[PDB]
């Protein structure tokens, strides 16, 4: 599949790739462009929606603008962006297979005008002229009278309604809502009855939001829309009343459950679809069986009637052949979790269709020659430079609950609980669902959905030139208007969202204090709530001090503030529960007013259960269990087989009930903890923004002082670096919060739901045992006792629990990608003598410049840099090496010196500021100098020629310690508390001067290390199944 890119908004209408077609059967016409076979792009807003809508409806997440995609420049930008996104999808193999399947899954055509697909009529045409035999009227040609007599529904009709162009997918701009990607069918009846119908997509590529620490690739959103459209193209769309429970709305006061259509769950991807699609089907519906039956019927219709018809063109026949070569179970198992792993795209995974309730979005503008390309985000998802859009002030904020804290009657604050925008249901779904006894009516999968898709065979299918249209292929478009209600819940004890909002502010004159009541009741609005104790303590300990004037004074403060933000936002306590080992985040209690009574959040969490954090406790509801032994007259063989079959069936039923209770835990209990994770995440981000603003205010105050311009520029660089350091220490806090609350949720399942499920199923086990006993009580002659003993269930019979299984249940592809792309080393040198290959694995892509004079030999455990030629240097360039005021790092390498002073081994130095390790006397010396004169010199002696030395140097600015390890022993434990900013160049140089040396495994880490890690690394590297001499040579 080749995406045609030679298109523009000014391209002439050739009626072959650029067309003007009527919108359904309305009076509107629109321009469409063909970018792929049966795939069109329409660079304009959707016709059906009203570009101007009443402010009453205006759904939440409501960026609304009637002047978007109006000018031709914006239209051409949209078309180019969509072409770029399609090329990005088509680049890999999974995306190419998906696009080929979309391009070949034409909706099933209707038969001839009389019904049926078997064969058309015959016409006798072209009678030969008369001759001596004469009357050659019968000697003529035979013709299929209706050729390609089938009637297609996937077609766009020109404005004059005399031309038709085949079309499976057309991509439009957004409707009324600017940021809302949607997929709409052409005919509702044909999207559910197995015929299949074309799809229209509303996609906005210019905006995206940020989740955690990454941006959402629009390619994944377009892929999700295409996967959803694959349902319509196959006519397997379920009814609109097939909603499954999605989230218990704990923010409410009445028990209500959010609901989600099954297509959204199947195609969204994440942990939610894997909590529903289980190994036995705890949730089953007639939809899966009906869809499978209809799909098999249509496949049989094709194989018996269409396949074999010689009066139908290959453009439809071959495309239908490839359409039915894919089993329907493959489409159900096709989710975003497959393409995210096949594309290395990080996306939200838990409750990803309800994120409107959790956090408020902030959108970013994306232009598409620069910010996004065929390879995706430029400079990666994490590090792509994007600018916040100007539409962030145009977002519609329609809440679902305006919490109004009251003093003693005035409103202290007001807040908003925005809704997920999902269909509600007051009736409890979990207490009205009967688990089926008699049972593949579901997905049951993975990574194998598109094996039957043949890219070459599909691409070799000639395009559909002429279309025999079906006059009733579209019906109408009905916009779904819906008003958003509210509920002014009035409380006296502040909700967690009141605590969350108390920390946000707009007036940049912070006076942060640890008193929520004082913050909310203050009139000047100069108070901001914060839980960072040492930050507040240190700031309140320097009130009576002279102002910061010299850049030294600055640096020292910016050091004290970052070395307090860390010991405040990265504080955990190891509380040993009767359920596991837990690290409890100490400030979590005073961040959201959860167990905030007394003066210890750890104590209450270590006294009450891990469920006391959440409010909607005890939400379990046992389903309507059935538990269906049907006369006697069997020998000791048939009876045993029947008993074994009933045993297996009952075990399966018990597993299904257990999976139902797992879903009950996930929907109603983990949602509480996920919401708590989101609120804690927002709290750290807020309290980061607070420090950032505090230091920026100091800088600005220092700028208007008697400081040299060069010193001020150095100050600014150090502050820009310490901001990234603060971001790192907050990300560490985020990880701590996530781990702690996930462990709490897992334990709550293992200590508050599993015993309840066991107690509930004890009665079912007793009933099953009684039924088996009654049935067993054509002869046995006391063997009936043995049979009844062999087929009686016990408490252990239905123990499905495994903490590893549930811990891996809540792990998604995003977590795996984050683990695979989170290195603890800035630089990790790799050498391989195969062609001499020198590279870096750390992922920062350090630029390595090495002369050809260097070679490669086997030093200790692999290829080692051998600097035989004198005056040969190797340099490594990376931004992170520039260092700063507050960042810890470490250098680890293996050195072998052949020469027998002052050889300048390695140095990252700029005039004075920097660090260096250089030969002197008979050993290496480590020198570290700042931009203020202060320096530290360490002489690590006893480094003789040859041998093999392992040097590990660690600088930690959090504790202000310099640890020097040689081989596996501590050589120095000095203090660097007198060393300020050491900002140096972005390059690290390795120079041999005139000293042939071997350098092996040189590595620069982004954090400090410990003696245990050094010893472990040394001994694990030295063990390579090789005998060594007294020096180290093998």
- Phi and psi, residue 692, nearest 5°: -45, -45
CA distances from 513 to 517, 694, 697, 699 (A): 10, 14, 18, 22
Instruction: Decide: helix, strand or coil at residue 265.
Output: helix
For residue 943 the two structure tokens come to: 């480094």
Instruction: Decide: helix, strand or coil at residue 990.
Output: strand
For residue 109 the two structure tokens come to: 């055509």
- 943 torsion bin: left (phi>0), alpha (psi -120 to 50), beta (else): beta
Residue found under tokens 């295409």: 226
CA dist 655 and 664 (Å) reads 14
CA dist 509 and 529 (Å) reads 13
CA dist 776 and 639 (Å) reads 9
Q: Are 72 and 195 in contact (CB under 8 A)?
A: no
CA dist 1009 and 994 (Å) reads 32
Cα angle for residues 844, 845, 846 (degrees, 5° grid): 100
CA dist 156 and 933 (Å) reads 76
**Residue partners of 31: CB distance under 8 A and separation at least 6:** 13, 18, 19, 20, 42, 43, 44
CA distances from 74 to 49, 65, 84, 368, 377 (A): 19, 14, 15, 12, 21
- Strand-by-strand arrangement of the 913-920 sheet: 847-850, 873-877, 987-991, 906-910, 913-920, 923-929, 935-940
Question: CA nearest 634: which of 652, 621, 646, 616?
Answer: 646
Number of other residues whose CB lies within 10 A of the CB of residue 312: 22
Residue found under tokens 């009855």: 193
CA dist 662 and 276 (Å) reads 9
CA dist 28 and 42 (Å) reads 13
Residue found under tokens 């006294």: 607
Q: Are 251 and 417 in contact (CB under 8 A)?
A: yes
DSSP 336-382: HHHHHHHHT-----SSTT-HHHH----EEE--TTTSEETTEETTHHH
Q: How far apart are the first and last CA of the chain?
A: 55
Q: Are 220 and 340 in contact (CB under 8 A)?
A: yes
CA dist 673 and 617 (Å) reads 12
Instruction: Please report the resolution in angstroms.
Output: 2.8
Output the CA torsion sign for 382, 387, 392, 394. Answer: negative
Instruction: Decide: helix, strand or coil at residue 41.
Output: strand
CA dist 232 and 107 (Å) reads 8
- Phi and psi, residue 686, nearest 5°: -65, -45
Residue found under tokens 């959040």: 601
Q: Are 356 and 418 in contact (CB under 8 A)?
A: yes
Q: Are 627 and 767 in contact (CB under 8 A)?
A: yes
CA distances from 53 to 50, 66, 175, 176, 837 (A): 6, 9, 10, 7, 62
Q: For residue 510, list its beta bridge partners.
A: none
- Phi and psi, residue 644, nearest 5°: -65, -40
Which CB contacts under 8 angstroms, 24+ apart, belong to 120-128? 120/144, 120/145, 120/146, 120/147, 120/149, 120/311, 121/145, 121/146
For residue 1013 the two structure tokens come to: 């890690």
Q: Are 780 and 787 in contact (CB under 8 A)?
A: yes
Relative to beta strand 363-365, strand 997-1005 is unpaired
CA dist 999 and 864 (Å) reads 6
Q: Tell me, letter by letter, the H, E, C secondary structure of 497-534.
A: HHHHHHHCCCCCCCCCECCHHHHHHCCCCCCCECCCHH
CA distances from 411 to 54, 417, 489, 519, 828 (A): 31, 17, 12, 14, 58
CA distances from 844 to 226, 383, 999 (A): 34, 11, 21
For residue 801 the two structure tokens come to: 């629990």
CA dist 203 and 40 (Å) reads 13
CA dist 756 and 51 (Å) reads 53
Q: For residue 909, list its beta bridge partners.
A: 914
For residue 171 the two structure tokens come to: 């991509």
Which CB contacts under 8 angstroms, 24+ apart, belong to 571-578? 572/736, 572/740, 573/602, 575/602, 575/605, 575/606, 577/606, 577/610, 577/747
CA distances from 605 to 438, 585, 589, 602 (A): 44, 10, 9, 5
Give the max Cα distance, the chain: 129
CA distances from 242 to 43, 262, 286, 292, 422 (A): 33, 6, 10, 16, 14
Instruction: Decide: helix, strand or coil at residue 88.
Output: helix
Q: For residue 937, list its beta bridge partners.
A: 927
**Residue partners of 789: CB distance under 8 A and separation at least 6:** none
For residue 186 the two structure tokens come to: 């052409």
CA distances from 766 to 525, 627, 653, 772, 990 (A): 65, 11, 15, 10, 76
Q: Are 17 and 34 in contact (CB under 8 A)?
A: yes
Instruction: Decide: helix, strand or coil at residue 217.
Output: coil
CA dist 196 and 184 (Å) reads 12
Question: CA nearest 85: which of 179, 204, 200, 183?
Answer: 204
Total residue length of the chain: 1034
Residue found under tokens 């003789």: 944
DSSP 442-497: S------TTTT--HHHHHTSPP--S--B-TTS----------------EESSPPHH
DSSP class of residue 851 equals: -
**Residue partners of 582: CB distance under 8 A and separation at least 6:** 574, 575, 576, 740, 743, 744, 747
CA dist 761 and 622 (Å) reads 9
CA atoms within 13 A on the CB side of 607: 7
Question: CA nearest 220: which of 330, 105, 98?
Answer: 98
Instruction: Decide: helix, strand or coil at residue 727.
Output: helix
DSSP 604-659: HHHHS-TTTT-SS-------B-----------TTHHHHHHHHHHHHHHHHHHHHHH
Cα angle for residues 883, 889, 892 (degrees, 5° grid): 125
Element (H, E) at 257: strand 257-260
Number of other residues whose CB lies within 10 A of the CB of residue 285: 17
**Residue partners of 52: CB distance under 8 A and separation at least 6:** 66
Residue found under tokens 């405040």: 568
Q: Are 1004 and 986 in contact (CB under 8 A)?
A: no
3-state helix, strand, coil in the chain (%, to 5): 35, 20, 45
H helices present in 704-811, as ranges = 709-752, 754-776, 783-790, 803-809
CA dist 25 and 157 (Å) reads 9
CA dist 144 and 311 (Å) reads 6
CA dist 735 and 729 (Å) reads 10
For residue 504 the two structure tokens come to: 């946000």
Output the CA torsion sign for 407, 409, 410, 416. Answer: positive
Q: Are 384 and 377 in contact (CB under 8 A)?
A: yes
């Amino acid at each position: 599949m080749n995406i045609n890119d030679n298109l523009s908004i000014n391209s002439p209408v050739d009626n072959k790739n650029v067309v003007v077609v009527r919108a359904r059967k309305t009076d509107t016409v629109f321009k469409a462009f063909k970018v792929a076979p049966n795939i069109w792009v329409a660079p304009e807003r959707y016709y059906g929606e009203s570009l101007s809508i009443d402010e009453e409806y205006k759904v939440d997440g409501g960026i609304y603008d009637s002047n978007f995609l109006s000018q031709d420049s914006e239209k051409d930008k949209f078309l180019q962006a969509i072409i770029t996104l399609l090329k990005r999808i088509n680049s890999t193999n999974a995306g190419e297979k998906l696009l080929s399947l979309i391009s070949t899954a034409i909706p099933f055509p209707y038969g001839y005008i009389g019904g049926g697909y078997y064969a058309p009529n015959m016409i006798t045409f072209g009678s030969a002229p008369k001759s001596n035999k004469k009357l050659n009227s019968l000697i003529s040609s035979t013709i299929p009278f209706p050729y390609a007599g089938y009637r297609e529904t996937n077609y766009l009709s020109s404005e004059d309604n005399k031309s038709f162009y085949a079309s499976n997918i057309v991509i439009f701009g957004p409707g009324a809502n600017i940021v809302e990607n949607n997929t709409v069918f052409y005919k509702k009846e044909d999207a559910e009855n197995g015929m299949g119908t074309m799809t229209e997509i509303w996609f906005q590529p210019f905006l995206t939001y940020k989740y955690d620490e990454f941006y959402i690739d629009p390619a994944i959103e377009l892929i999700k829309c295409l996967i959803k459209s694959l349902y319509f193209l196959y006519g397997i769309k379920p009814s609109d009343d097939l909603v499954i429970p999605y989230r218990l709305r704990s923010e409410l006061e009445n028990i209500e459950y959010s609901q989600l259509n099954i297509v959204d769950l199947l195609v969204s991807g994440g942990i939610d679809p894997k909590f529903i699609n289980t190994d036995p089907y705890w949730f089953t519906d007639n939809y899966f069986s009906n869809a499978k039956k209809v799909f098999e019927d249509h496949r049989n219709i094709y194989e018996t009637q269409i396949e074999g018809n010689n009066a139908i063109g290959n453009d439809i026949k071959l495309r239908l052949k490839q359409k039915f070569r894919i089993n329907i179970n493959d489409i159900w198992e096709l989710n975003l979790n497959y393409f995210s792993k096949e594309f290395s795209i990080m996306m939200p995974d838990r409750f990803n269709n309800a994120l409107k309730h959790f956090y408020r979005k902030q959108y970013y503008k994306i232009d598409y020659p620069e910010n996004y390309s065929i390879n995706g985000f430029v400079n990666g998802q994490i590090n792509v430079q994007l600018s916040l859009s100007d539409r962030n002030q145009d977002i519609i904020n329609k809440p679902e609950e305006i919490i109004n804290l009251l003093n003693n009657n005035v409103s202290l604050m007001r807040s908003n609980i925005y809704g997920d925008g999902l269909k509600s249901t007051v009736d409890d779904f979990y207490s009205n669902y009967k688990i089926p006894y008699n049972r593949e009516y579901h997905f049951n999968n993975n990574d194998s959905s598109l094996d039957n898709v043949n890219i070459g065979v599909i691409d070799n299918i000639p395009e559909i030139i002429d279309v025999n249209p079906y006059k009733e292929n579209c019906d109408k478009f009905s916009p779904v208007q819906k008003i958003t209600s509210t509920r002014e819940i009035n409380t006296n004890i502040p909700w967690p969202i009141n605590y969350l909002q108390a920390q946000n502010t707009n007036n940049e004159k912070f006076s942060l204090s640890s008193d929520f009541v004082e913050v909310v009741s203050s009139k000047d609005k100069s108070l901001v709530y914060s839980f960072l104790s040492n930050v507040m303590f240190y700031l309140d300990s320097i009130k009576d001090n002279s102002p910061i004037d010299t850049d030294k004074k600055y640096y020292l403060w910016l050091r004290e503030i970052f070395r307090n933000y860390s010991f405040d936002i990265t504080a955990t306590q190891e509380i040993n529960t009767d359920c596991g080992i837990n690290k409890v985040v100490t400030w979590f209690g005073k961040a959201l007013n959860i167990l905030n009574t007394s003066d210890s959040f750890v104590e209450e969490f270590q006294n009450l259960g891990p469920i006391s954090l959440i409010n909607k406790k005890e939400n379990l509801s046992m389903p309507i269990i059935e538990i269906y032994i049907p006369m006697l007259g069997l020998p000791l063989n048939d009876l045993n087989e029947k008993l074994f079959n009933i045993y297996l069936k009952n075990i399966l039923y018990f597993k299904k009930v257990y999976f139902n209770f797992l879903d009950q835990w996930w929907t109603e209990y983990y949602s509480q903890y996920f919401d708590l994770i989101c609120m804690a995440k927002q709290s750290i981000l807020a309290q980061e923004k607070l420090i950032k603003q505090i230091i920026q205010n100091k800088l600005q105050d220092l700028f208007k002082a008697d400081i040299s311009m060069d010193k001020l520029n150095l100050m600014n660089l150090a502050t820009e670096k310490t901001f990234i350091d603060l971001s790192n220490e907050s990300q560490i806090a985020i990880n701590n919060i996530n781990d702690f609350l996930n462990k709490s949720a897992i334990c709550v399942f293992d200590t508050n739901i599993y015993p309840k499920f066991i107690s509930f199923m004890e009665q079912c086990i007793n009933s099953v045992n009684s039924n088996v006993t009654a049935f067993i009580q054509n002869i046995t002659e006391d063997e009936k006792l043995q049979l009844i003993k062999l087929n009686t269930f016990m408490n252990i019979d239905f123990e499905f629990f495994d903490i590893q299984s549930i811990k891996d249940l809540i792990t998604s592809e995003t977590d795996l990608i984050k683990e695979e792309k989170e290195s603890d080393y800035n630089l990790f040198l790799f050498t391989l003598q195969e062609d001499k290959v020198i590279e870096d694995i750390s992922g920062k892509n350090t630029l390595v410049k090495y002369s050809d004079s260097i070679s490669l030999v086997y030093g200790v455990n692999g290829d080692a840099l051998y600097l035989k030629e004198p005056d040969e240097s190797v340099s490594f360039s990376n931004k992170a090496f520039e260092n700063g005021l507050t960042n810890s790092f470490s250098i680890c390498f293996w050195l072998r010196n052949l020469g027998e002073i002052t050889s300048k081994l390695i140095e990252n130095k700029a005039d004075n500021c920097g660090w260096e390790i250089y030969f002197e006397n008979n050993g290496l010396v480590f020198s570290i100098v700042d931009c203020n004169g202060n320096e530290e010199n360490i002489y690590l002696s006893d480094v003789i020629s040859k041998n093999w030395y392992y040097i590990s140097i660690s600088i930690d600015r959090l504790r202000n310690q310099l640890l020097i390890f040689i081989n596996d022993k501590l050589i120095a434990n000095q203090s660097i508390e007198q060393i300020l900013n050491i900002y140096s160049s972005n390059t690290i140089s390795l120079v041999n001067e005139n000293n042939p040396i071997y350098i092996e495994g040189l590595s620069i880490l982004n954090r400090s290390i410990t003696s245990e890690e050094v010893v472990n690394n040394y001994f694990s590297y030295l063990n390579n199944s090789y005998i060594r001499d007294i020096s180290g040579e093998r």
